[PDB]
Amino acid sequence: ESFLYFAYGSNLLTERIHLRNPSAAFFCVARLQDFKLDFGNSQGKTSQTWHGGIATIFQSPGDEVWGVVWKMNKSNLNSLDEQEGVKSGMYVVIEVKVATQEGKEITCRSYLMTNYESAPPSPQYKKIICMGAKENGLPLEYQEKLKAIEPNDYTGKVSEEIEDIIKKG
Amino acid sequence: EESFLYFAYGSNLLTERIHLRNPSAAFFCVARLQDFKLDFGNSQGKTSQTWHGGIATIFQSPGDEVWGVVWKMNKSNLNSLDEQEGVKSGMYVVIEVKVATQEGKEITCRSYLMTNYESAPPSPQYKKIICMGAKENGLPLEYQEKLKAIEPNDYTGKVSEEIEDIIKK
């Protein structure tokens, strides 16, 4: 009756995932080996939510990505696909096998872009990813990699709910 | 359940090909993936030493379509098929897609695509297999025309005796 979702983007942050998925439950932190984090514009179009590149991953040996695994009810599948832009061609659904820090492999659903042009993330998007990694105790080493991601020069505003999340943190 | 559904769009269109690593695979139906374009590429910039040209992949692209075959397989087969597509070595990533049959029924399948590749044309031997299976498994004739119109590379050496034998006849 449930599935596991691997989040490496803005759904690292508990407050953020719950906005549209309030029943999501923290399962654990995990590592996707041989993938690399990237940001970009789907179909070459800038996200009008985030106003910068949005998170995605691709196979890259030697590389890793840390994320948070959420447990969700199977009734939320279509909604999460809808959230991630699957019908509109923004992400594709993937199955990945991630590793917990005590050596356990977990099989999860996640999402990645197949057709994007690489592009830096907006500060607010960066900040949401940073807060989520810290909230959920991703490794400090990984957090520093995130802190070092150069953002674009967007100086306007995102949605008030996001903009208010940031003011709290 | 006991079973899962797999959507082949490359060399596993051919029954004789799929059956050599997955003998219990059974034909389910022919189906269409919307807003996806077929391509051929070298994963990680490595040429297939099996096929000696670009091997098949898909990416999201509104407007276009990819036709293929849905195979029904035992869920005991899962790991095997992953090994076959080199998931662990970063050659393909596992995806979920929804496909429509010619009578309009939507199906949820497993498939694969490449996340990190250079575009490269397929070998003549590979194109044949793909065409042989498009034909044998009743893919629509206009789509067969599209496959037939693929420009192969100039490779005219030996492939594996098993692949060369399938082709002869």
Curated annotation (Swiss-Prot), chain B:
A Pfam family that the UniProt record links to this protein = AIG2_2
Q: What is its EC number?
A: 4.3.2.9
Give a yes or no for keyword Phosphoprotein in this entry.
yes
Q: Which Gene3D superfamilies match?
A: Gamma-glutamyl cyclotransferase-like (3.10.490.10)
- Kindly state which keywords UniProt assigns to this record, in alphabetical order: Lyase, Phosphoprotein
Reactions catalysed, as given in the entry: an alpha-(gamma-L-glutamyl)-L-amino acid = 5-oxo-L-proline + an L-alpha-amino acid
One Gene Ontology MF term: protein homodimerization activity
Q: What induces it?
A: By geranylgeraniol.
Record GO biological process = release of cytochrome c from mitochondria
Its GO CC terms are: cytosol; extracellular exosome
Q: What is the uppermost EC class here?
A: lyase
- Effect recorded for residue 92 to F: Marked decrease in catalytic efficiency and specific activity
Positions carrying Phosphoserine:
160
Q: Does the keyword Phosphoprotein apply?
A: yes
What positions does the entry give for substrate binding? 6-11, 126
Instruction: Give the positions the UniProt entry annotates as the active site.
Output: 85 (proton acceptor)
Q: How does it assemble?
A: Homodimer.
Q: Which family does it belong to?
A: Belongs to the gamma-glutamylcyclotransferase family.
The protein's name is Gamma-glutamylcyclotransferase
Q: Which gene encodes it?
A: GGCT
